[PDB]
């Protein structure tokens, strides 16, 4: 199907310890494969997947130089935004950056994104045309202008449509045995009597990859979105994900509710009913 490589950077300022803390991670689809921690003695881009260790030491040197550069530019961005929003040096703040590229089943360029956020709110994004920018507040207008001056759009597009997708393909075909897979969910259903005149039907769907999954409840065919407890897809630790969806059911009406599951690994969706 469709694959994606996304890079995440997080830098948090701590007045009193000077140098902010900077953590960066790399993901291919829903699998982390690289990392860098500022306060780590390593001071190098470390691997987090087994299919990336194949790369030689030159690759790691280049990636380390790059990520350290990105750390510096973040250390500048913190102060710059402190000036823009006119905030005091006595306050902690967080700068977040995310950018990557996607490819379709033909392994060609479909989408590419790049976006900055300051303290959890969107700061400046790249629209899906890769030529213009989305600016949130007056402070981001200045950045938008600065970038429109140095033709950052064309450069970033040249990267996303070139190196990004290429080495995404390389990563896919290197770690093929894990990244190129579709583990169907292992669904089951539990039924707990919350009371004498009620019940809870919990629909478990666990051990599946990728994380993209749909899990809904229906009563007589219509969705129970208003009365459905739904946790967020959570990791298991071995590269698979878990998710369950529960509903409150009047006692004696279990046969009316059905749990619907959709995932890339299931040829056709699944429909479950208790007993």
């Amino acid at each position: 199907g469709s694959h994606s490589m996304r890079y995440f950077y997080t830098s948090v300022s701590r007045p009193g310890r000077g140098e902010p803390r900077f953590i960066a991670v790399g993901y291919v689809d829903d699998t982390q494969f690289v990392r860098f921690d500022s306060d780590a003695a390593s001071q190098r881009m470390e691997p987090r997947a087994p299919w990336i260790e194949q790369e030689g030491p030159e690759y790691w040197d280049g990636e380390t130089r790059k990520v350290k550069a990105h750390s510096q530019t973040h250390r500048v961005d913190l102060g710059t935004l402190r000036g823009y929003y006119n905030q005091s040096e006595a306050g902690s703040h967080t700068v977040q950056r995310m950018y990557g590229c996607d490819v379709g089943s033909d392994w060609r360029f479909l989408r590419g994104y790049h976006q900055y956020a300051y303290d959890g709110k969107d700061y400046i994004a790249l629209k899906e045309d890769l030529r213009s920018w989305t600016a949130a507040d007056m402070a981001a207008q200045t950045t938008k202008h600065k970038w429109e001056a140095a033709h950052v759009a064309e450069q970033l597009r040249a990267y996303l449509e070139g190196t990004c997708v290429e080495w995404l393909r390389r990563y896919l075909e290197n770690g093929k045995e894990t990244l190129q897979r579709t583990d169907a969910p292992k669904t089951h259903m539990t039924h707990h009597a919350v009371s004498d005149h009620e019940a809870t039907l919990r629909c478990w769907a666990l051990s599946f990859y990728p994380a993209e999954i749909t899990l809904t409840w229906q009563r007589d065919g219509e969705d129970q979105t208003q009365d459905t407890e739904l946790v967020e897809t959570r990791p298991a630790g071995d590269g698979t994900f878990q998710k369950w969806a529960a509903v409150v059911v009047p006692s004696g009406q279990e046969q009316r509710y059905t749990c619907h599951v959709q995932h890339e690994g299931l040829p056709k969706p699944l429909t479950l009913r208790w007993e």
Binding site: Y7, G26, Y59, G62, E63, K66, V67, A69, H70, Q72, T73, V76, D77, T80, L81, Y99, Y116, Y123, I124, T143, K146, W147, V152, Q155, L156, Y159, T163, C164, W167
Partner: peptide, 9 residues
Amino acid sequence: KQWLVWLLL
């Protein structure tokens, strides 16, 4: 592989 350009705000 990640981007080679420095991008300041």
